[PDB]
Amino acid sequence: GYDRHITIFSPEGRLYQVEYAFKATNQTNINSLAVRGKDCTVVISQKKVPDKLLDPTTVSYIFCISRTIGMVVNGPIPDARNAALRAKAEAAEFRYKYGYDMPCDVLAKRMANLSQIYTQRAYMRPLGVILTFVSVDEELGPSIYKTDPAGYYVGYKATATGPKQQEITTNLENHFESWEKVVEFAITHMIDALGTEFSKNDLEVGVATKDKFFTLSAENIEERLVAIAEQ
Amino acid sequence: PIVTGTSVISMKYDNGVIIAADNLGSYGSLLRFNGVERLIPVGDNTVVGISGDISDMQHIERLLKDLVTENAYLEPSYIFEYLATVMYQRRSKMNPLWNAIIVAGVQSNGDQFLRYVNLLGVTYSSPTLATGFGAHMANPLLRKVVDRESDIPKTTVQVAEEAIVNAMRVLYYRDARSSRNFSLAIIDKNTGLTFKKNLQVE
Amino acid sequence: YDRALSIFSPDGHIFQVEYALEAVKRGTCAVGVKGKNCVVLGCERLKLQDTRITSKVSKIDSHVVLSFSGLNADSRILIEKARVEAQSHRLTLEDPVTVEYLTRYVAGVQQRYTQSGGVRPFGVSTLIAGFDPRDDEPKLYQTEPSGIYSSWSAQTIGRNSKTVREFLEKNYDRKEPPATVEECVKLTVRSLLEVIEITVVKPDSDIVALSSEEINQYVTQIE
Amino acid sequence: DIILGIRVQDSVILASSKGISVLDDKTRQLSPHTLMSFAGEAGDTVQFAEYIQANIQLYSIREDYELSPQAVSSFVRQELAKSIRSRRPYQVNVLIGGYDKKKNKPELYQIDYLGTKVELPYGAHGYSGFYTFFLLDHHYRPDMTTEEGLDLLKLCVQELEKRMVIVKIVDKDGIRQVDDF
Amino acid sequence: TSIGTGYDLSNSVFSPDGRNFQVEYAVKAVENGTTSIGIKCNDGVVFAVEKLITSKLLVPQKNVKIQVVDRHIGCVYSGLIPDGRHLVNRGREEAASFKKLYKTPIPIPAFADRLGQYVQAHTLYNSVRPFGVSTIFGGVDKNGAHLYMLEPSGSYWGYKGAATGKGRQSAKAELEKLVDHHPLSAREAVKQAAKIIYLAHDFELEISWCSLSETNGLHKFVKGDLLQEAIDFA
Amino acid sequence: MFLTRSEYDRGVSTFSPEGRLFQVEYSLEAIKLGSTAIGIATKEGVVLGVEKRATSPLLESDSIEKIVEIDRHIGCAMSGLTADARSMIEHARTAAVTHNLYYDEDINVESLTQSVCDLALRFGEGRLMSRPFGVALLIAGHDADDGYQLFHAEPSGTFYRYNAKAIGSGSEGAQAELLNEWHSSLTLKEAELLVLKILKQVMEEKLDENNAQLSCITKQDGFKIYDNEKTAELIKELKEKE
Amino acid sequence: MFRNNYDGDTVTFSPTGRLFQVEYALEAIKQGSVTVGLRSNTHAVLVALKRNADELSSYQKKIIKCDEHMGLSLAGLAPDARVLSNYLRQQCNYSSLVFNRKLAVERAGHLLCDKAQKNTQSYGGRPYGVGLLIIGYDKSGAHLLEFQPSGNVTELYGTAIGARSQGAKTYLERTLDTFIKIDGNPDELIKAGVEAISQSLRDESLTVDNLSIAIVGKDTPFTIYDGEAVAKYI
Amino acid sequence: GEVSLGTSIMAVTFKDGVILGADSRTTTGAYIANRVTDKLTRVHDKIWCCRSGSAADTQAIADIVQYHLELYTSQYGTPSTETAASVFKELCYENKDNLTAGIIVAGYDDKNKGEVYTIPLGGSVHKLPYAIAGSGSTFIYGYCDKNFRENMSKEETVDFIKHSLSQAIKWDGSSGGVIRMVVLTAAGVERLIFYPDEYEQL
Amino acid sequence: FNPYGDNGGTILGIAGEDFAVLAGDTRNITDYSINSRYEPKVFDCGDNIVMSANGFAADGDALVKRFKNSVKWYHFDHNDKKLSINSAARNIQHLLYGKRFFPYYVHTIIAGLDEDGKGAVYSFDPVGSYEREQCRAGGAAASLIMPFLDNQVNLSVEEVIKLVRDSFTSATERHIQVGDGLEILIVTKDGVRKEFYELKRD
Fold first, then answer.
1. What transmembrane ranges does the database entry give (chain H)?
2. How many other C-beta atoms are found inside a 10 Å radius of the C-beta of residue C88?
């Protein structure tokens, strides 16, 4: 009854409203991929426009949360942008209070803890997005932490999200000096796993290094695809 | 106050109002900032001249800039009442703005406007207005040109401008906290707001 | 319309407030009788109960008394608020609370708790009796969960109220009210036998709980 | 503004000194067997005494029981200290004299303006606190009886008026007014 | 499935498929409004509206539907009137505040984000309903022309050409052809924008545009000879 | 085209089709439960009459107070949920007394009824109450600006200047007769008899000095509630005239 | 049938995108008595048909003055009219104290628009059930604003709101070309307005009691003609 | 007992950037608590702050400005030197009754190249080609004016700052130690340190 | 900080048998310097009410401003009915009394016609207290005015206006703050009339 419309336990002991939030992450029909290099972390994400009129430049699910931290969101962007501003503000406050840059994992904990509020409060709904923070911590090195509306957060050596995450992840499990190499490595497995060729307009890439996190432009992505074609 | 602008002087003539101020912000006995503009145009028909604490002057300046912004979605009296309310209320809050303000302008109906307001909210109009040290030096000199309302129509732009500039020279010579550089604004019902910068006292 | 205080029924009365009255009707019987110069309050009373640490008639002040019917828990808290007001009035002001004032305040508290959907109104009807300070006119008042307070010559609230309010209506004459402590006490006792504890309040803060009422019971029973 | 207290073997004797001319100042009856006498600033001291009377009366009505003098004295001490927390202290001096029915023994307590409580055989405040101890300490005895106490009070008061009062007694019979100082 | 009975009577509720139906219903309110389009040019943007005249009693000069959020921003909406004008004023407040603080006109991408957060904030709690307007807005800034279109869901994107309202499918189809045919000058788009509205369609044609070259970065309406020329082309 | 339940009446903020606010309309149904109250305005003073509606003979009918004094020249007659009325009367008394303190002038009853209606309006934005007042009151007062006047204040927040008004149970019958019988030249004495005559028809029980009480507003006497002796005489005179 | 499930409050959109709870509020105006407003270049006039609760009751006030230069009429819920009118009057007076400017008629109608549109977005509150016809004269000149409870304010040459207001609207449209040219003739403009409202009548005829008239212009501060003063215009 | 910043600080715009210089001595009365202090505080990668007045209030304000700018940076990209000065004014002015803060802001941006903003204790903001503050600045006001030139090169500006602060250090004992300098330019932030043996003999 | 200034001047109110008079000088003053020669010190509030608050101008102008606002609110609430003099007096008392522990330093007077038509004059203590008086003066030269009038009064509205002219003419002769211009407001059932006369300039 009420368990279906508000986040309270059903007779089966499960929160239906929270589980329906997971299914909303696949509404955008976008899947991502994040892998760790020796000194850098790279995250890949599809950019299905698909409309001709829609400008591909503004269609980006990758956000530069902080100088060193960037996150990739799977799900509706209105919830993603709301999550970004939260993380974009938690990182700054942490630096102000504690005098050093926000670590990747702690940010996932803060955002995950905030999500836990929505899963317990009856009048607050779960956000409905999956956040994948990628950064190169000065202590733990490259790290990937993924947050989900249920409030869980887990570190990954390599992760994929979206409708076809199972297809992508299985390939990485089978497989398991510069960020340009990992970008090509990540793109190749995305092509191999999904089987769809990619162009500059259909792909967006984000790279986390020791100094900062940056998102490759359309022309920069084309260069990596050209390098792959050389194989 | 810490950083202060010494004086503003103004006088209303037959066809408009003239207001002048020296471009200096004094740090006590130190003539530190000789680039501080203290005449704030608030449109094509009015100028607000401010003396006293420069830091509070810049707080007044934004309120005037907000005033044009919020309205644009003004009259000289319109602007003064807004300032007078703020100055009074800041006094009532025991948190005054350490400034004396002359609002000079020409109404849309051609009526000339000159009103003074200080940190205490005290306000008064006059054919000639001056703040601080200029109230004792320039005001007697300007009053000789326009001693009463009847003299307003008998005073031309050149005479009023000459009297204002002459008052600045006397003001500069005997005012220790003054500067040779001053800005002068002429607001006329016909030619509109004329604004002259970095004039030299000689 | 039944499940909220803020909703009027189409016929024009709030059912939820009414439902609070039936709670009073389920409570123990209480009675009150006004004499010429006195007021009498009677109440309806297991094997292992500790009878020495129990009186349904709780005095709000030296000169005021308050019986009740309905939920006992609500009454115990409504009484406490009245007691504080009685002393607070005696503090902010000098004179003690008027009997009409106390019932007005008590009714206000009950009325106040009806002004929100998140609060359960007190399911208790009070039967306030006493004398105004330095006055000899008995005063008896009744309050209801709805917040309406009324002045009664004789009233009964709770279990078996209609049957007892019919016995009083025919035996009590407003033009021939009882003029003796015994007379009103007999009427109160006779009132309760139609279905014993009796309390008598007299002017100048003279409140006494009667004992050995069996004499009146034996006298009334024979007649 | 003089307040006196003497704890005789079966009662407590409280005495108090009286534009506007009349024909019960500086005293309040907290309970049938408890009496409270106060001295200090006019105004700030009576509201406190009135407030204490209400609370003690409220307790008596609520429980239908007579709060013991020791408990009453403690309550006054906490309220007086609690009053001074958020304001500048005010000159107040309170004497609590009561008969403990449960223990069947009189009790007298002294509370200073700072909120310190003392159990006393006798006590005083004001101009009476400078010399009168020289007399009471020499003449007071524990087994002194009521009638003897008022001779001592009549004696004591006599010295007070030489270098210069309404009297009440608390006993098992309750508060009692007296004309024989 | 377009009704979602059971999960559609309250806001901020996820259906078993992950959809929030109240937002979807707000989209349908948008689809009933007068079709409005926005064309992004090489030097600016163009807005067009099929204002359906209701009666002669309306004052023609004061009956304007292409709102101007800021001197350099043009806004046009389709859907519920109370929400559209409510959003415009709130967007107007943001533009003024940004100028007040940073002393520069608010960038279009930044302006869109501020609106997106406000619109999205009404899809979080059940005490409020999502705005029932899809707002087409754009302008010119340091980075050039920008055209944005936010939905009741709070989602917005940059567009080369946008359309809303009842006459949406036809306008979008023709709008795609225009981009495909001329992948425009501020002058040319005004004629094309008029053409699309007439094809989409008693109604009057309202057009506005803002370009760097022909209006030095300010937003102005189409009047006089220019208007008639656009009608003649259509 | 199936029959289904409609919930446009349960809520207070819920509009029904055609824009009817039912909860306010249901509030008026509560007034019809209240005792009849009559009020006639004319020269020489206004007159108020209220059925006391003794629930039981033991009830102190001498203490039933459906008429309350707000200002020495203003009187109010209430009908409906008396519990809600006490809130309004207290506010009205404060406003009238406050006006004297602030202006040293008797509050204009036209302004007083405006203040009272602002309180009954509070179920929405002036919110302080969850539901509209279930009491409709009848204000009779004299101000030296408009003369002897009578005002009827509905719980909806609207007040009307009434020459003659009847509220509460049987108001429909009372109003119909007041339309037949009221006239400009109605003197105070016959108005008092008229009020009693109206009470005779719509009061379910016998009319008596114990269950009916009259009041009037006069410049010289102000607001005064008639003693039981006078009402008995007027009732005696009324049946003699009949 | 299906409307009952989605008309509970002003927060639920129907599957077709309709927001019923606010539609009913607009329909509440039809319960109110007809009021007519019209203006010329220099003069603006309000005409209202008051109603009485009973033949023994005074006719309800229907025209209010916010200042000497502008006023308004009412139609719909009385309680809402009380709130909105006095709230607007609280704004006429506020501006003068701090700023000493007359609050322009256009600003008066728009500050109220934000008030109504909030109630249509939040739970608990309800949309206002009152429509206003605001007439004034300022530097710009004559003004006539019709405020609907849905936060829609429209500048109008003439209009009519209330029960059977369609008839008056039709007459005004048929005579728009005429009464606009009635400049400098306040007496004739009122006669046109009185004629305009007359078409909305069914049974009741014009009388000095029920009829109320207001006019404002360059030479006429807001004046309300009621009672015997209205006999000439009948 | 609040610690006041005894300072001799200086900022100079030059051809292709701006240079911020300061001493390294902080004194409590006549005692030198620390002689290697880093008075050049970073509020952003290309914006550097320097504090005068109370060391507690300014340090608290500087942290907030860095917090706000970092908040701004994450949203609208790297801020301008003008923006940072605006942030300082809000904190400095609205808290002028409680916080005793005097600031110099020097930064580099693509749009405006190098810029310098000085905020005296009054809370006012003044944009200048160069700025000097601190107790030791009173002794070089007449030297900086005579020697300062517009659009100087890095070598001249570095030498100009060295000579200017050497004299302030020489005459003011509240200022001394090593001359730490920050060169803000499109090439990037550069740090320079000059020991007493390098500048005293100049 | 001192929140209270001074402006000098004097006011006078006379309650004629039928008419009422309120007079005051036009000069505004600060510590021996003439701020202006014509500032209207007496105001008309409508409803045959003339008001004047002497002393601190910023306190006086606020009091009249709030009182005028109260009159407008009174009109709205009371069907635009006229405000009686007694009603205004108590209204002003609440305004004055509403700031006891931070009161206006103004000795204000209101003149008008009471209900029956006789002249009315009310003088208010700065803390609110008022009393009906036949004639009253307040300000600097008040002590120099009342004694002269009392000789000649204790009379029409054209022969009292002679005495007030001479009275103020005498005060300006021996008193320096007395103004260089006299304002007189005449209240009768006809209405309110303003008359101005010139005084000594120095």
1. none
2. 14
Locate the domains of chain D by residue range.
1-181
D151 vs A231: CA distance, rounded Å: 123
G99 contact residues in B (CB cutoff 8 A): 78, 81-82, 85
Q: Which two tokens stand for residue E182?
A: 């001329």
Chain G nearest CA to I90, separation (Å): 22
H47 phi/psi in degrees, rounded to 5: -120, 125
Given CB atoms, is G204 within the 8 Å cutoff of chain E? no
Instruction: Give the C-alpha separation, E78 to D118, whole Å.
Output: 83
The CATH number given to F22-241 is 3.60.20.10
CA–CA distance from H194 to each of G47, H35, H49, H181 (Å)?
87, 13, 20, 8
At I179, is the secondary structure helix, strand, or coil?
A: coil
* In chain B, where the domains are located: 1-202
Say which of A21, A58, A78 has its CB closest to residue E153: A78
Contact D54 C59 (CB under 8 A): no
Q: How far is CA G162 from CA A105, F18, G113, in A?
A: 64, 12, 19
Q: Which of F150, F119, F139, F153 is nearest to F28 (CA)?
A: F153
Q: Diameter of chain E by CA atoms?
A: 56
Adjacency order of strands within the sheet including I20-25:
I135-139, I10-15, I20-25, I181-188, I191-198
Domain ranges of chain F: 22-241
* Contact partners, residue D114, CB within 8 Å, separation at least 6: D81, D84, D89
Query: I68, I5, I14: which is closest to I33 by C-alpha?
Result: I5
Instruction: Please report how the helices H81-94 and E81-102 are oriented relative to each other, as an axis angle in degrees rounded to 10.
Output: 90
**Strand (E) positions, chain E?**
36-40, 44-51, 67-70, 73-79, 133-141, 144-150, 156-158, 161-163, 204-211, 219-221
Chain H interface test: which of B2, B38, B65 (most H C-beta within 10 Å): B2
Token pair in block for residue C159: 């279990």
CATH 1.10.238.10 fits domain E21-233: no
Chain B residue numbers touching G98 (CB-CB < 8 A) = 81-82, 85
CA B38 to chain centre: 8
Identify which of A229, A203, A221, A190 has the alpha carbon closest to the alpha carbon of residue A34: A190
The domain locations on chain E are: 21-233
Count Cα atoms within 13 angstroms, Cβ side, for F127.
17
Which pair of tokens denotes residue A91? Answer: 């990182």
What is the Cα D62 distance to its own chain's centre? 25
The span from the first CA to the last CA of chain E, in angstroms, equals: 39
Q: Which chain E residues are Cβ-neighbours of G41 within 8 angstroms?
A: none
Beta carbons of E85 and G151 less than 8 Å apart: yes
The approach used to solve this structure was cryo-EM
Asked if residue G39 lies in contact with residue G182, where contact means CB atoms within 8 angstroms, the answer is no
Question: CA angle, corner D99, sides to D97 and D105, nearest 5?
Answer: 115
What are the structural domains, with CATH classification, of chain I?
10-198 (3.60.20.10)
Please answer yes or no on whether G93 and I69 come within 8 Å at the CB atom. yes
Chain centroid offset of residue A206 CA: 10
Cβ-based neighbour number of residue D139 at 10 Å: 13
- For the record, the structure tokens of C162 come out as 């209609």
Q: What whole-number distance in Å separates Cα of residue F102 and Cα of residue F115?
A: 15
Q: Residue I12's closest CA among I130, I127, I108, I155?
A: I108
Which helix or strand (DSSP H or E) is residue C221 part of? helix C214-222
Length of chain G (residues): 234
Q: State CA E42 to chain mean position distance.
A: 19
Tell which residues of chain F come right before a gap with C–N over 2.5 A.
Answer: 126
- Using an 8 Å Cβ cutoff, are A84 and A95 in contact? no
